[PDB]
């Protein structure tokens, strides 16, 4: 069940809503106006590191289960996503 | 407390918790009969209860040092709730939000909270940065120092104490740091006791 979630499920969740856009259309008066824009934030591939710990002093290293139990830490691994930020523009459709 | 019966300068008095008394070890006289379990008493304010089932959980903790004396209760959707009233009552709370210039400067804490989570910094660091800032922000010693760099300087002041290692260059990139400015602001605050 957990494996299915990691290998597949996790990505499909990052792709359902995924992309979020914000459009800043002008008043169309005259310069600085008559500039319509639309900005994109896109979610690509999801990466999952093997388990690690980020110590007080900078240093992030591999965390093993015994260490986790003994130092009361969470046996967690990092989630990484390829994010792309696209920008578009039109005057007073394209 | 101190034993009336004897009275030798250092009062050697014992807390016989299991027997529920405060006793004078020297003479044997019980000085108090009423005794409370502090740890179990504290568990009525801070607890496992998030549900609101616990008849023991009757209070709530607060941080005077940072929150000050602001006791507030969310108006929220319960089991039976017409959304109309929740909106109405919360709309009403909005008009009643006419808070001071410093009761609106608690939004500078909301900034540090957003800056620490972004810096992958612990809860203790925030509570230290929010502390050092709350003490120096109004200061004449600081005066018209770059407000953006004053709160970034308190993040290093918080990190230095909580032993959480962070470089000046790290915090510099985290917000935007004018090196000489955020080095001067980090010294007036460091001088502020
Ligand atoms: Zn005595």
Ion ligand 1: residues, Cβ under 5 Å: B 3, 5-6, 24, 26-27, 29
Residue B155 and residue B162: Cα distance in Å, rounded?
11
Resolution (A): 3.4
Q: How many CA atoms lie within 13 A of A7 on its CB side?
A: 4
- Give the DSSP per-residue string, A6-74: IIIIHHHHHHHS--EEE------SSTTSS-EEEEEEEEEEEEEPPPEEE-SBS-EEE--HHHHHHTT--
Query: How distant is the Cα of A53 from the closest Cα of chain B, in angstroms?
Result: 12
Tell me which of A53, A56, A73, A80 to substitute to probe the interface with B (most B C-beta atoms closer than 10 Å): A56
d(CA B1, CA B15): 11
Q: Which residue of B has its CA nearest to A59?
A: B165
Q: Which residues contact B174 (CB under 8 A, 6 or more apart)?
A: B115, B118, B119, B152, B155
CATH architecture type of domain B1-193? Orthogonal Bundle (1.10)
- Measured between CA atoms, the residue of chain A closest to residue B119 is A58
- B169/chain A closest Cα distance in angstroms: 13
What torsion do the CA atoms of A5, A6, A10, A11 make, to the nearest 10 degrees? -120
B20 CA distance to ligand 1 middle (Å): 17
Domain definitions of chain B by residue range? 1-193
């Amino acid at each position: 069940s957990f494996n299915q979630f990691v290998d597949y499920t996790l990505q499909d969740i990052i792709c359902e809503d995924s992309t979020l856009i914000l459009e800043q259309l002008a008043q169309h008066t005259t310069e600085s106006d008559n500039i319509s824009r639309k900005y994109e934030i896109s979610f690509g591939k999801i990466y999952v590191t093997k388990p690690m710990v980020n110590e007080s002093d900078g240093v992030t290293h591999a965390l093993y289960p015994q260490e986790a139990r003994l130092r009361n830490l969470t046996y967690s691994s990092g989630l990484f996503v390829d994010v792309k930020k696209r920008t578009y523009e039109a005057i007073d459709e394209l | 407390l101190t034993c009336p019966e004897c009275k030798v300068y250092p009062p050697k008095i014992v807390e016989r918790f299991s027997e529920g008394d405060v006793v004078c070890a020297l003479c044997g006289l019980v000085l108090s009969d009423k005794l409370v379990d502090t740890r179990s008493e504290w568990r009525t304010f801070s607890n496992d209860d998030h549900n609101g089932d616990d008849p023991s959980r009757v209070g709530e903790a607060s941080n005077p040092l940072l929150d000050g004396n602001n006791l507030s209760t969310r108006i929220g959707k319960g089991e039976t709730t017409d959304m109309r009233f929740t909106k109405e009552l919360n709309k009403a709370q909005g008009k009643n939000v006419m808070d001071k210039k410093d009761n609106e400067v608690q939004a500078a804490f909301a900034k540090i909270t957003m800056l620490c989570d972004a810096a992958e910094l612990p809860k203790i660091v925030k509570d230290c940065a929010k502390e050092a800032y709350k003490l120096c922000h109004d200061e004449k010693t600081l005066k018209g120092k770059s407000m953006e760099s004053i709160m970034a300087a308190s993040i290093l002041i918080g990190c230095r104490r909580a032993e959480v290692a962070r470089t000046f260059k790290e915090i510099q990139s985290l917000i935007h740091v004018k090196t000489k400015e955020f080095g001067k602001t980090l010294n007036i605050m460091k001088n502020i006791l």
